[PDB]
A paper describes a structure:
SARS-CoV-2 Orf6 antagonizes host interferon signaling by inhibition of mRNA nuclear export through its interactions with the ribonucleic acid export 1 (Rae1)–nucleoporin 98 (Nup98) complex. Rae1 is a messenger RNA transport factor that can anchor to the Gle2-binding sequence (GLEBS) motif of Nup98 (Nup98GLEBS) at the nuclear pore complex (NPC). We determined the crystal structures of both SARS-CoV-2 and SARS-CoV-1 Orf6 C-termini in complex with the Rae1–Nup98 heterodimer. In each structure, SARS-CoV Orf6 occupies the same potential mRNA-binding groove of the Rae1–Nup98 complex, comparable to the previously reported structures of other viral proteins complexed with Rae1-Nup98, indicating that the Rae1–Nup98 complex is a common target for different viruses to impair the nuclear export pathway.
Given that Orf6 from SARS-CoV-1 has high sequence similarity with SARS-CoV-2 (∼85.7%), we anticipated that Orf6 from both viruses could interact with the Rae1–Nup98 complex. To confirm this interaction, we synthesized the 21-mer peptide of Orf6CTT for SARS-CoV-2 and the 22-mer peptide of Orf6CTT for SARS-CoV-1, and recombinantly expressed and purified the Rae1–Nup98GLEBS complex by using the baculovirus–insect cell system. The results showed that binding of each SARS-CoV Orf6CTT to the Rae1–Nup98GLEBS complex occurred at a 1:1 ratio in the nanomolar range (K d = 277.8 nM for SARS-CoV-1 Orf6 and K d = 141.6 nM for SARS-CoV-2 Orf6), which is approximately 50- to 100-fold higher than that for a 14-mer poly(U) ssRNA binding to Rae1–Nup98GLEBS. The results showed that both SARS-CoV-2 Orf6CTT and SARS-CoV-1 Orf6CTT competed with ssRNA for binding to the Rae1–Nup98GLEBS in a concentration-dependent manner. To better understand the molecular basis of SARS-CoVs Orf6 inhibiting mRNA nuclear export, we determined the crystal structures of SARS-CoV-2 Orf6CTT–Rae1–Nup98GLEBS and SARS-CoV-1 Orf6CTT–Rae1–Nup98GLEBS to resolutions of 2.8 and 2.5 Å, respectively. Both structures were solved by molecular replacement in the space group C2, with four Orf6CTT–Rae1–Nup98GLEBS heterotrimers in one asymmetric unit bearing virtually identical confirmations. The final structures were reliably refined with good stereochemical parameters (R work and R free values of 0.21 and 0.25 for SARS-CoV-2 Orf6CTT–Rae1–Nup98GLEBS, while 0.19 and 0.23 for SARS-CoV-1 Orf6CTT–Rae1–Nup98GLEBS). The composite omit map of two structures unequivocally showed that residues 53–61 of SARS-CoV-2 Orf6 and residues 50–62 of SARS-CoV-1 Orf6 accommodate the same site of Rae1. Each peptide of Orf6CTT adopts an identical elongated loop conformation (0.43 Å RMSD for 9 Cαs) and binds to the Rae1–Nup98GLEBS heterodimer alongside blades 5 to 6 of Rae1 β-propeller. The sidechain of a conserved methionine (M58) in both Orf6CTT inserts into the hydrophobic pocket made up of residues F257, W300, D301, K302 and R305 in Rae1, which provides high steric complementarity and buries a large surface area.
Residue numbers in the entry:
A (entry chain X): 50 to 62
B (entry chain B): 158 to 174, 179 to 213
C (entry chain A): 25 to 263, 265 to 366
C-alpha cells in the first residue's frame, strides 16, 4: 500500500 | 449509418510545457465524417446492422 | 495484462461490453453492485468485505442498457435502455416493470428524492428530459433539451445535463424541477460524462465534465473568481520525452470519492487516474489495460472503486472482438484518493 508521486495537473494556459 | 468508413485518427495540435505539439485524436467521433454522433449512437447503429 | 493492477475480479462478468455501474445506497446493509451491458442484461452482485463476489440476480431489456441507479431506500434498481424504455426492478421479488417511455434510447436515469416529491429522471436521445412517479403511465413532467442527452448527474437539489453540440444545463430541484442555468460549455468537443461535487459543507456546488478530447472541466456554480476558480486539465493522453505526436483518448467516466471530494477518471486509453481538483494534482495513474475502461463508480463509503474493462467503440466496429473477455475490477482506493498532508 505505497503511494505514487503526486504530479501537478496539466492545466490549460 | 454505422461505422463503415475506416477509422483514421485525425491529427491536430496542442500545447505542452509552452510549445505547440502535434497530436493524433484516437477517437473515431473526432473525424469530420463521424462528429455528429456519439460513440454509443454509432455502436447501436452497428448493432442494428449486425456489423459487429 | 488483462488485470495489470492485480485488483479483485467480479465473478461472472457480463457477456458483452459493460455500459454502466452503480453501487447500493447506504440505506442498504452491505454493498451491492449493479451493471448493465450491451447484451441487454442488468446484473447484481453482492460484494463481501472479504472481496469475494456472489452473483445475486439478473434482469433483461430488449436493447443495450445505457444507465442504472438505485432508489434511496435500496429496494429498487432503475434501468435505462436502447429499447426506449426504463424499468423499475424490485430486488426482493426480482420483478421488473416498465415505468418510462421515450421516442429514442434512454441514455441517463436518476432517482430524485426531494422533501416534497420523489421521481425517476430519464434523459434520452429524443431531446427530452422526463420525470416519472413509477406509478402512472404519464410522465409527471416533460422538459425539452437543446439536443440529444449524453450524460447527467443528480444530487438534490442540483441536477446537470449535457447534450450533443456542447449543450450544458444545470437544473434546480426544490419543489419542482426547473431550468436553473444554461452554461456556455468550457469544453470544445463532444461531451461524454459528468459528475456533481460538493462543497466542504456537503451541498452540491459544481460538477466535473469529460469530453472525447482528453480533457476534464471543473466548474463551480457560483465561485468568487470564475476566470480563475473554473479550469480544464488534460488527461488520458500518451506520454517519456518522446517527439511522436501525442495520442488523445476519450474520457469515459468520472466519479467523486464520497468521503474525500477527490475524483477518478477512466478513459479510452485503458487507464484510470485519481485527481485532487483543489490542489490541482494527479494522485495516481494506473497501468494500461488491454482495452478501454468503459465505466466506473464508488460504493457508498468510498472503500470500493469499481471499474469496467470493455471496448467502447472508440475506433469503430472493426476493432470489436466479440469476445475478448470483459471485466469488472474492485480496488480499495480510499487512501490512494486521500488528499495530501
Amino acid at each position: 500500500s505505497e503511494l505514487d508521486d503526486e504530479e501537478p495537473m496539466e492545466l490549460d494556459y | 449509418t454505422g461505422t463503415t468508413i475506416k477509422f483514421n485518427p485525425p491529427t491536430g495540435t496542442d500545447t505542452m510545457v509552452s510549445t505547440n505539439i502535434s497530436t493524433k485524436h484516437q477517437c473515431i467521433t473526432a473525424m469530420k465524417e463521424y462528429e455528429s454522433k456519439s460513440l454509443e449512437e454509432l455502436r447501436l447503429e452497428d448493432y442494428q446492422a449486425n456489423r459487429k | 495484462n488483462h488485470n495489470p493492477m492485480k485488483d479483485i475480479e467480479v465473478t461472472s462478468s457480463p457477456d458483452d461490453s459493460i455500459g454502466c455501474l452503480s453501487f447500493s445506497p447506504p440505506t442498504l446493509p452491505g454493498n451491492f453492485l449493479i451493471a448493465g451491458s450491451w447484451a441487454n442484461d442488468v446484473r447484481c452482485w453482492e460484494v463481501q468485505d472479504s472481496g469475494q463476489t456472489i452473483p445475486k440476480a439478473q434482469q433483461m431489456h430488449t436493447g443495450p442498457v445505457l444507465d442504472v441507479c438505485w432508489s434511496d431506500d435500496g429496494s429498487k434498481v432503475f434501468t435505462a435502455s436502447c429499447d426506449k424504455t426504463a424499468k423499475m426492478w424490485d430486488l426482493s421479488s426480482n420483478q421488473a416493470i416498465q415505468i418510462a417511455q421515450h421516442d429514442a434510447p434512454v441514455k441517463t436515469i436518476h432517482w430524485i428524492k426531494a422533501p416534497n416529491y420523489s421521481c425517476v429522471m430519464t434523459g434520452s436521445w429524443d431531446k427530452t428530459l422526463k420525470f416519472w412517479d413509477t406509478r402512472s403511465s404519464n410522465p409527471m413532467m416533460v422538459l425539452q433539451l437543446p439536443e440529444r442527452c449524453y450524460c447527467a448527474d443528480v444530487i438534490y437539489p442540483m441536477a446537470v445535463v449535457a447534450t450533443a453540440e456542447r449543450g450544458l444545463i444545470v437544473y434546480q430541484l426544490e419543489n419542482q424541477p426547473s431550468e436553473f442555468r444554461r452554461i456556455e460549455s468550457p469544453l470544445k468537443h463532444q461531451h461524454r460524462c459528468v459528475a456533481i461535487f460538493k462543497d466542504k459543507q456537503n451541498k452540491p456546488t459544481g460538477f466535473a465534465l469529460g469530453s472525447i478530447e482528453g480533457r476534464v472541466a471543473i466548474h463551480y456554480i457560483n465561485p468568487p473568481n470564475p476566470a480563475k476558480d473554473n479550469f480544464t486539465f488534460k488527461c488520458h493522453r500518451s506520454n517519456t520525452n518522446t517527439s511522436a505526436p501525442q495520442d488523445i483518448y476519450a474520457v469515459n467516466g468520472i466519479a467523486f470519492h464520497p468521503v474525500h471530494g477527490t475524483l477518478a477518471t477512466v478513459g479510452s486509453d485503458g487507464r484510470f487516474s485519481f485527481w485532487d481538483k483543489d490542489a490541482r494534482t494527479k494522485l495516481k495513474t494506473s497501468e494500461q489495460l488491454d482495452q478501454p475502461i468503459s465505466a466506473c463508480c464508488f460504493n457508498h463509503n468510498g472503500n470500493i472503486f469499481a471499474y469496467a474493462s470493455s471496448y467502447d467503440w472508440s475506433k469503430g466496429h472493426e476493432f470489436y472482438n466479440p469476445q475478448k473477455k470483459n471485466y469488472i475490477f474492485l480496488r480499495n482506493a480510499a487512501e490512494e484518493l486521500k488528499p495530501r498532508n
